[PDB]
Amino acid sequence: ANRFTANIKGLTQASRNANDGISIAQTTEGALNEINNNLQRVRELAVQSANSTNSQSDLDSIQAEITQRLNEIDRVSGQTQFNGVKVLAQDNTLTIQVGANDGETIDIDLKQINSQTLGLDTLNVQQKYKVSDTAATVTGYADTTIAL
């Protein structure tokens, strides 16, 4: 009977652990949902940009919104955390203890997700502008601490 009680306690606590696991899974999934929506919008913009009628100012605007979306992706990637553990900042493995004995466990894999690991940091729709310069000859004066 004492053995039975020991096992009962163990399994109850294991149930608690598994609940913890579900919670962290839900949190990470929630973050990924918004990242997905951002990527949808970025694809929309990419489609819009390829139209040859766009003037370069328009490409600049489209790139502005693209850049802000990417910055938001990185913000979510860096800041999101659960009980201190930054879920999406780095690749890492988690293990949940779901049984009463060694190895009666479940593993959760996690990935660094951001503009860099998605290979989108270089995403740019801008065409080259043309650059020229002119000689701005400034006649003028100012004083320096060196004394007379």
Binding site: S23, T27, G30, Q68
Partner: protein
């Protein structure tokens, strides 16, 4: 304060269009930041619930 115009202003339309470009660029920036805020608020709601 607006200095007094001494002469007629040449190429006025170029300058006016440059001003229009300034204005619309700024409007674009503000729209983009608004959208970022929408995303942030959505994320905050979901995070709080979880």
């Amino acid at each position: 304060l607006a200095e007094a115009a001494a002469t007629t202003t040449e190429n006025p339309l170029q300058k006016i269009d440059a001003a229009l470009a300034q204005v619309d660029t700024l409007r674009s920036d503000l729209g983009a930041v608004q959208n970022r805020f929408n995303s942030a608020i959505t994320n905050l709601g979901n995070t709080v619930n979880n």
